[PDB]
Amino acid sequence: KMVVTLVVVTTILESPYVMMKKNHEMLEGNERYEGYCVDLAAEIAKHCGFKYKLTIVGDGKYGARDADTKIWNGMVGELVYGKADIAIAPLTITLVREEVIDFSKPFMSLGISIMIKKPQKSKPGVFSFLD
Amino acid sequence: YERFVPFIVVTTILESPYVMYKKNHEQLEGNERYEGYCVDLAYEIAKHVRIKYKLSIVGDGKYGARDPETKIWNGMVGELVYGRADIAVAPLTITLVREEVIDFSKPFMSLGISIMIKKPQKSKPGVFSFLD
Amino acid sequence: KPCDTMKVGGNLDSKGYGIATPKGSSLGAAVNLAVLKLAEQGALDKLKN
Amino acid sequence: RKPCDTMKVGGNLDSKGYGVATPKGSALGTPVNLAVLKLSEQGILDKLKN
Amino acid sequence: TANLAAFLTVERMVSPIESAEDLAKQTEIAYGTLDSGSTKEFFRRSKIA
Amino acid sequence: ANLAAFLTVERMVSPIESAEDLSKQTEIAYGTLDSGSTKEFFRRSKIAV
Ligand SMILES: *[C@@H]1O[C@H](CO)[C@@H](O[C@@H]2O[C@H](CO)[C@@H](O)[C@H](O)[C@H]2NC(C)=O)[C@H](O)[C@H]1NC(C)=O
Ligand SMILES: O=c1[nH]c2cc(C(F)(F)F)c(N3CCOCC3)cc2n(CP(=O)(O)O)c1=O
Ligand SMILES: O=c1[nH]c2cc(C(F)(F)F)c(N3CCOCC3)cc2n(CP(=O)(O)O)c1=O
Fold first, then answer.
1. Most buried residue among A37, A66, B27, C15 by CB atoms closer than 10 A?
2. Ligand 3, from A75, A88, A92, A114: best to mutate by most atoms within 8 Å of Cβ?
3. Which residue spans within E1-49 are E strands per DSSP?
4. Where is this protein localized, as stated in its record (chain A)?
């Protein structure tokens, strides 16, 4: 016949941000994962026009600098030491992380809340006679 | 062969409780004429940096807008773009059309769209309510 | 599940997540403009719902 | 405020937030944002809010 | 007796307004916004039905 | 009438409403995580509550 002549996007498994699919072993590429941040990176690539690569963080850590080694770990250490390109994950924007890398504007604002159970019917008892 | 080898206006608007005038505002001068949230915020920024400032007031009363005809930003946005001011510490909404002309820091106070009601009380009288 | 809890009260502090980029990167400002465009169009609240 | 006859109901509806304005290409904007982050983590914003 | 029971049944009816869907569910109590601003631009350029 | 009113609706409410309710009582306990920025927030707080 005719013979011829001759962007790293890191995150962590968190619900509902990054969740596993059903046939995750039967898929390949970037279609194996799904969730909030997957569609977020899809919207970023739609409004910016660039190829992406959905990768998984190795240590499973968010970010911390030891007082002895002075080395950041997790996706923070991936962005500082050049192991990754951009991180799309719920990573808390702090002052100590601003000194090494940058951040965008907060798309999702939040705070500290109170988790209590739903009030079921409790037995009133002896107080029911004069309730 | 090689190369050429070489070798503060703060603007705001009168809004409560952010910027409010003092009671004896005519009896003082300088930056101490006013008070509120943003005055204390600017004093804390000057404490954490160490640069003297100057509190100015925007004249037109407009926050910031660009007309489709003139293409001219008004208010404190026009002061920052056309150099009439140096820095703005004021409750201005960080939008997409304002990021491309001037920069912004990280948001310090988040908020949202609220609902205001009449807040009804349980004004239940006595003898007038028994014959209900 | 089991739909047996609930959350009450207002938020206690000002926390927020955003897109992180290394320092001195040229992509950070267009990514931030894209984030602001997604915020103003309400698509973020659509994905939240 | 007086006469104390109103109240706020429900949660927030959109993602709104105020920040410090600075000119584009200003060299002094980054220490301003660092001071904003320091005042946020120090909780002085909550103190002025209260 | 039955009428007072009915009035006290009325006395513990529907909780006050707590969401935008509560505003959409009623029509007796009207509501309004400011005549100008990005608040009105939020509703004018909305996508949520 | 009032006994029928209590038996009719059966809208039981939550005992805790505000953030100061944890300071107001001590019968129902409350806790945070052993490590994280939440413990630093409660530790380095300036509010007396
Ligand atoms: C005179 O010109 C110089 C040169 O542009 C100005 O210095 C610049 O100031 C800006 C302020 O943010 C810096 O970002 C630049 O790096 C400076 N340039 C240099 C070469 O140092 C100076 O401000 C001008 N003097 C004025 C306007 O009074
Ligand atoms: O840039 C803007 N910044 C604004 C800042 C504020 C304040 F909170 F006081 F700082 C207010 N107010 C909140 C409601 O009561 C009246 C004053 C309105 C603003 N508007 C008008 P919008 O477009 O209707 O939001 C702007 O345009
Ligand atoms: O940068 C950080 N980002 C974090 C992000 C998350 C979330 F995104 F919600 F998963 C959480 N979780 C809170 C509850 O759900 C389980 C884990 C912890 C984070 N922590 C630890 P912190 O110090 O306690 O805030 C960080 O340090």
1. A37
2. A92
3. none
4. Cell membrane; Postsynaptic cell membrane; Postsynaptic density membrane
